[PDB]
């Protein structure tokens, strides 16, 4: 098994996913504080796929510089906050799901 | 902890993404040992989106129980090795990305 090469791919995916989580947390905050801006943010995201997170951030710089700053900031905090718990949490989630599917497959016999 | 909801949502996402990576690897092994099953698998993945990994596995066990059991095992083994590299890779990539976006933002009026 090619653990490191798959890790590199997974890292690229996770970079975009954590940008998505940052945008999500900021939207939830704006929904209490400035709903018009949360709405604007929601519309921007349907025009620009967060999957292409570098392109997403560059596009936003043309329309809302302050929000880009906020996303980069939150995404950085999130990463630092979350990343070290991930190995255990992901492996645990997979073990649980494996148990679940095995029991369903046994019921399927 | 902190970011519990985020960390959890991220874990479930990576669980699906690592299932994708498991199926991809298995598909490659099957192309050598049982090309007809490699083809069945490709067709199966076209019709069932791997992003919905639990539904994918639940559908497959109706048709091919052995392959489900193999995916469960591979995705766990893969996760063990992949998650060891992930934190530092993802942090350093976010760092590089920030650097690029920072320059982009600072260099314009």
Swiss-Prot record, chains A, B:
GO terms for molecular function: protein folding chaperone; protein homodimerization activity. GO terms for biological process: carbon fixation; photosynthesis; ribulose bisphosphate carboxylase complex assembly. GO terms for cellular component: carboxysome; cytoplasm. Keywords: Bacterial microcompartment, Carbon dioxide fixation, Carboxysome, Chaperone, Cytoplasm, Photosynthesis. It comes from the Bacteria. Induction: Part of the rbcL-rbcX-rbcS operon. Its main location: other. It is found in: Carboxysome; Cytoplasm. Belongs to the RbcX family. The homodimer has 2 functional domains, a central cleft essential for production of soluble RbcL in which the RbcL peptide binds, and a polar surface which plays a role in correct RbcL subunit arrangement. An RbcL-specific chaperone. Required for assembly of the RbcL8 core, acting downstream of the major chaperonin (GroEL-GroES). Acts on newly folded RbcL, has a transient dynamic interaction with RbcL and is eventually displaced by RbcS. The central cleft of the RbcX homodimer (RbcX2) binds the C-terminus of an RbcL monomer, stabilizing the C-terminus and probably preventing its reassociation with chaperonin GroEL-ES. At the same time the peripheral region of RbcX2 binds a second RbcL monomer, bridging the RbcL homodimers in the correct orientation. Homodimer (RbcX2). Interacts with the exposed C-terminal peptide of RbcL ('Glu-459-Asp-468'); binds 2 RbcL peptides per RbcX2, stapling them into an RbcL2 dimer. A slightly longer peptide binds with a higher affinity, but no long-term stable interaction with RbcL is detected. Contacts a second RbcL monomer via its peripheral polar surface. This is RuBisCO chaperone RbcX. It comes from Picosynechococcus sp. (strain ATCC 27264 / PCC 7002 / PR-6). The lineage of its organism: Bacteria, Bacillati, Cyanobacteriota, Cyanophyceae, Oscillatoriophycideae. The gene is rbcX. The chain holds residues 1 to 109 of 134 of the full protein.
């Amino acid at each position: 098994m090619e653990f490191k090469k798959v890790a590199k791919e997974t890292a690229i995916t996770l970079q975009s996913y954590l940008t998505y989580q940052a945008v999500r947390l900021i939207s939830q905050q704006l929904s209490e504080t400035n709903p018009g801006q949360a709405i604007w943010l929601g519309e921007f995201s349907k025009r620009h796929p967060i999957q292409e997170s570098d392109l997403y951030l560059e596009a936003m710089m043309l329309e809302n510089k302050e929000l880009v700053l906020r996303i980069l900031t939150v995404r950085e905090n999130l990463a630092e906050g979350v990343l070290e718990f991930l190995p255990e949490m992901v492996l645990s989630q997979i073990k649980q799901s494996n148990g679940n599917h095995r029991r369903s497959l046994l019921e399927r016999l």
